[PDB]
Design an enzyme around this catalytic site. Structure first.
Site, PDB file in Angstrom:
ATOM      1  CG  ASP A  40       1.523   2.443   6.824  1.00 51.31           C
ATOM      2  OD1 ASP A  40       2.378   1.593   6.435  1.00 51.31           O
ATOM      3  OD2 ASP A  40       0.896   3.207   6.046  1.00 51.31           O
ATOM      4  CG  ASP A 236       4.799  -0.651   3.844  1.00 51.25           C
ATOM      5  OD1 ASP A 236       4.145  -0.317   4.882  1.00 51.25           O
ATOM      6  OD2 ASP A 236       4.424  -0.403   2.676  1.00 51.25           O
TER       7      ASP A 236
HETATM    8  C1  DJS Z   1      -1.188  -4.840   6.467  1.00 51.92           C
HETATM    9  C2  DJS Z   1      -2.649  -4.751   6.122  1.00 51.92           C
HETATM   10  C3  DJS Z   1      -2.959  -3.928   4.887  1.00 51.92           C
HETATM   11  C4  DJS Z   1      -4.467  -3.776   4.847  1.00 51.92           C
HETATM   12  N1  DJS Z   1      -2.584  -4.712   3.697  1.00 51.92           N
HETATM   13  C5  DJS Z   1      -2.086  -4.035   2.575  1.00 51.92           C
HETATM   14  C6  DJS Z   1      -2.034  -2.648   2.451  1.00 51.92           C
HETATM   15  C7  DJS Z   1      -1.461  -2.062   1.333  1.00 51.92           C
HETATM   16  C8  DJS Z   1      -1.257  -0.596   1.316  1.00 51.92           C
HETATM   17  O1  DJS Z   1      -1.496   0.116   0.352  1.00 51.92           O
HETATM   18  N2  DJS Z   1      -0.655  -0.173   2.480  1.00 51.92           N
HETATM   19  C9  DJS Z   1      -0.504   1.216   2.847  1.00 51.92           C
HETATM   20  C10 DJS Z   1      -1.321   1.520   4.125  1.00 51.92           C
HETATM   21  C11 DJS Z   1      -2.712   0.955   4.128  1.00 51.92           C
HETATM   22  C12 DJS Z   1      -3.128   0.233   5.235  1.00 51.92           C
HETATM   23  C13 DJS Z   1      -4.410  -0.279   5.299  1.00 51.92           C
HETATM   24  C14 DJS Z   1      -5.293  -0.094   4.239  1.00 51.92           C
HETATM   25  C15 DJS Z   1      -4.871   0.620   3.129  1.00 51.92           C
HETATM   26  C16 DJS Z   1      -3.591   1.150   3.072  1.00 51.92           C
HETATM   27  C17 DJS Z   1       0.977   1.584   3.015  1.00 51.92           C
HETATM   28  O2  DJS Z   1       1.129   2.947   3.439  1.00 51.92           O
HETATM   29  C18 DJS Z   1       1.816   1.384   1.751  1.00 51.92           C
HETATM   30  C19 DJS Z   1       1.333   2.203   0.570  1.00 51.92           C
HETATM   31  C20 DJS Z   1       2.592   2.418  -0.239  1.00 51.92           C
HETATM   32  C21 DJS Z   1       3.740   2.311   0.736  1.00 51.92           C
HETATM   33  N3  DJS Z   1       3.195   1.803   2.002  1.00 51.92           N
HETATM   34  C22 DJS Z   1      -0.961  -2.858   0.305  1.00 51.92           C
HETATM   35  C23 DJS Z   1      -1.127  -4.220   0.512  1.00 51.92           C
HETATM   36  S1  DJS Z   1      -0.556  -5.473  -0.621  1.00 51.92           S
HETATM   37  C24 DJS Z   1       0.114  -4.616  -1.934  1.00 51.92           C
HETATM   38  O3  DJS Z   1       0.343  -6.403   0.065  1.00 51.92           O
HETATM   39  O4  DJS Z   1      -1.796  -6.090  -1.117  1.00 51.92           O
HETATM   40  N4  DJS Z   1      -1.635  -4.826   1.589  1.00 51.92           N
END
Ligand code: DJS
Length: 393
Positions: A40, A236
């Protein structure tokens, strides 16, 4: 000249997909405990499941590690989707398909969580690769990569090649497939074609960049460039979608609808909720536009552009009835926290996180999905004035 790949040990060390995450194998503790860890670049805490959970097949067992150190402090980390709570500690960590080094790093042992772990994702923890400024509880909790660089001779740079298949993968197919590469301490020239173009990291907290122009099929979206970076733009790997500030999202979808208007899609599709399906092999890629994001260059008044295809922003999903149709969800969505260049956009490119030189490089990925008529692109230079004004304060 022919491009040579000099990081064979690390090539093909990732698995996963954009919807559930790309992960690398790591070991923690003594004797080593193997765990799959989501990569991440949008967070700065290294954390692992450390107690039974219905979605975890394994977890870190601190009582079985002779090198475990308790920091006697709790930690809470909220994300866009999900959150977790845990207990801080340190332990020895290694990356089996990584540099041949072992480092002592901070580890948050996750004890409680909500909508964080994903059923069948095959990962048990997260590796926050961004900077200490955004680490929880505060910036005194040194992130993993800072520890790695401080304790070894590994250069202060890593690069990511996230490989989307272009079709759905079940849990078994993910386990058996290569999802990409995380090159720690270098750039592997076999992973990209053409040239690497660099954008400055605006501030070291998230990997913050500045977008200076947006086009849909060459047509300028024509918004004040501060709108594209309101309140920031970041790269990201831990977010699935390309996320855009509300006003930019509304303009972009209007433009994408107009370009693809020979076919009408339901509102649920454009809101990223509903899948759309076509008969096997008939996906009409050519009706969907390419999207170009222009990024500030390293040279005064110069920019470059990265161009993605619908094969990047239409995410393959399995049908509700698991038929022979080819189905997708629209992987562009709105944000109230600025632009997020997520995994679906990173799948088009080899991305170099050059921390040493405070810059991010992009090149066309050797594994991007495309068709016989169009490919993703990274091109430049373009003369662009007052680019610093595109940054939001
Ligand atoms: C790539 C696979 C992951 C499971 N898909 C995600 C994760 C997040 C998220 O909060 N990412 C977190 C990390 C995370 C990974 C896996 C599960 C939860 C959160 C990350 O740190 C973000 C938070 C704010 C800035 N970076 C958001 C979305 S979205 C909005 O596209 O629906 N999709």
């Amino acid at each position: 000249p022919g491009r040579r790949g000099s990081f064979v040990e690390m090539v093909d060390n990732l698995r996963g997909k954009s919807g559930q995450g790309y992960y690398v194998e790591m070991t923690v503790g003594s004797p080593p405990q193997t765990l799959n860890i989501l990569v991440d670049t949008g967070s700065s805490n290294f954390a692992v499941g450390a107690a039974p959970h219905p979605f975890l097949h394994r977890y870190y067992q601190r009582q079985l590690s002779s090198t475990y150190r308790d920091l006697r402090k709790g930690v809470y980390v909220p994300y866009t989707q999900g959150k977790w709570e845990g207990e801080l500690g340190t332990d020895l960590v290694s990356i089996p398909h990584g540099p041949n080094v072992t480092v002592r790093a901070n580890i948050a042992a996750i004890t409680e969580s909500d909508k964080f772990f994903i059923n069948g994702s095959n990962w048990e923890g997260i590796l926050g690769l961004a900077y200490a400024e955004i680490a929880r509880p505060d910036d005194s909790l040194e992130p993993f990569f800072d520890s790695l660089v401080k304790q070894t001779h590994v250069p202060n740079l890593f690069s990511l090649q996230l490989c989307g298949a272009g079709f759905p993968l079940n849990q078994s197919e993910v386990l058996a497939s290569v999802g990409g590469s995380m090159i720690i301490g270098g750039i592997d020239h076999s992973l990209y074609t053409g040239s690497l173009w660099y954008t400055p990291i605006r501030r070291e907290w998230y990997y913050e960049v500045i977008i200076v122009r947006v086009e849909i099929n060459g047509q300028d979206l024509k918004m004040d460039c501060k709108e594209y970076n309101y309140d920031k733009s970041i790269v990201d790997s831990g977010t699935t979608n390309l996320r855009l500030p509300k006003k930019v999202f509304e303009a972009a979808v209007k433009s994408i609808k107009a370009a693809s208007s020979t076919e009408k899609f339901p509102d649920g599709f454009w809101l990223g909720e509903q899948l759309v399906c076509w008969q096997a092999g008939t996906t009409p890629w050519n009706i969907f536009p390419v999207i170009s994001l222009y990024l500030m260059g390293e040279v005064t008044n110069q920019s470059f552009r990265i161009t993605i295809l619908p094969q990047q922003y239409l995410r393959p999903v399995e049908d509700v009835a698991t038929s022979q149709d080819d189905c997708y969800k629209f992987a562009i969505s709105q944000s109230s926290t600025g632009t997020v260049m997520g995994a679906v956009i990173m799948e088009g490119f080899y991305v170099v996180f050059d921390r040493a030189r405070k810059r991010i490089g992009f090149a066309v990925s050797a594994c991007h999905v495309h068709d016989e008529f169009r490919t993703a692109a990274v091109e430049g230079p373009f003369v662009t004035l007052d680019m610093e004004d595109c940054g939001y304060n």
